[PDB]
Design a protein around this nucleic acid. Structure first.
Lengths: 140, 140
DNA sequence: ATTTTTTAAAAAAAT
DNA sequence: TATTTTTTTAAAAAA
């Protein structure tokens, strides 16, 4: 599968967009036999996510803010795992690929991505901003 | 006791030092009946700590780096609790006073300060740089 | 005043 | 290999 190189190029375009960005992504997806619609959806979700990060002061300011995940970030997470799974990638490999260890689609580690993916599937969390909850005993 | 206002003024001077800084601190300590030597020691330890933070990219860069505590920061911690205890302050009050909730001598919460103080006293940790250890199971 | 327990997240083993 | 549970660490607050 060429899903990794496609996602990599999608991020490359989001980080430096031009009037031919989406056309190039469609072409790359087509040549790889990857669904064009889902490829473009990811490009647009990623664009929004990065725009949101900037509205939150930037990647560094965001990674340390009180927000663990943004609603758009979770939408992106679900779309990324879904397209990669359809392309026959193993879960462990997807978590690695999307993380800080590789493509850096998300400013998250493979475990942050994978634990969240399963909580999302188990409906332990909703598709909405998720605040960083503090540890420690609860007040009396 | 006037230990809180003394520490506050010590930090005020460290944040904007002049040729009369230490003289003013000595005077304030004297008028409050607080040991002058320990007051000056704290001024110098605090100065070093803030210089170290700057060498580590700044307060924001440091609070998120892989270092939990700096050696000089622990030396400062011990000196601050010691002088405050001698001035009859309760432990809970000291942790609050030195923290982000009040004087901000340290870029730490009252619990980070208090838990570390006791680990230091119990010799569970040494007076040296302490790295931020990651959570999670240990590898097989 | 000092120690222990609890919680939440992250990491990786267990299933 | 997909999903769940356990473990560890730090932080928060009870014990």
């Amino acid at each position: 599968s060429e899903i990794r190189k496609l996602l990599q190029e999608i991020k490359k375009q989001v980080d430096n967009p031009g009037n031919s960005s989406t056309t190039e992504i469609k072409k790359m997806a087509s040549e790889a036999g990857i669904d064009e619609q889902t490829a473009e959806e990811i490009y647009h979700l990623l664009t929004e996510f990065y725009q949101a990060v900037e509205e939150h002061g930037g990647i560094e300011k965001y990674m340390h803010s009180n927000i663990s995940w943004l609603k758009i970030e979770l939408e992106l997470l679900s779309a990324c795992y879904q397209i990669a799974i359809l392309e026959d990638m193993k879960v462990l490999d997807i978590s690695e690929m999307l993380s800080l260890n590789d493509l850096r689609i998300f400013p998250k580690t493979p475990s942050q991505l994978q634990n969240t993916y399963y909580k999302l599937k188990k409906e332990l969390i909703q598709v909405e901003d998720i605040p960083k909850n503090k540890p420690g005993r609860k007040r009396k």
